[PDB]
A = this chain, B = another copy of it.
Amino acid sequence: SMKQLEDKVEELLSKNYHLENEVARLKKLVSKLEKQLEEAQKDYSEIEGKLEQFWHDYDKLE
C-alpha cells in the first residue's frame, strides 16, 4: 500500500508535468498572439492614416 502511494505520486507527477508543458505552450502562444495583435493594430492605424491623407490631398485641389 506504500508501493501503491508511490505509484500514485509518480502517476500524478507525470500528469502534472504534461499539464505544465501544455500551460507553458499556451502562455507562449498568448504572448505571440498579443504581439501579433499589437502589430495588426499599428498596421490598421497606418493604412487608415494613409487613405485619409491621400483623400485629404485629393480634396485640397479645389
| A contact set with B: CB distance below 8 Å | 1-2, 5-6, 8-9, 12-13, 15-16, 19-20, 22-23, 26-27, 29-30, 33-34, 36-37, 40-41, 43-44, 47-48, 50-51, 54-55, 58
The answer to whether A19 touches B12, judged by C-beta atoms less than 8 angstroms apart, is no
Interface of A is mostly: helix
User: In the complex, what residue of chain B is closest to A37 when comparing beta carbons?
Assistant: B37
Q: Which residues of B sit under 8 angstroms from A16, Cβ to Cβ?
A: 12, 15-16, 19
Q: Which residues of B contact A50 (CB under 8 A)?
A: 51
* Residue in contact with A36 in the complex, picked from B20, B22, B37, CB distance below 8 Å: B37
**Closest B-chain residue to A49, C-beta based?**
B47
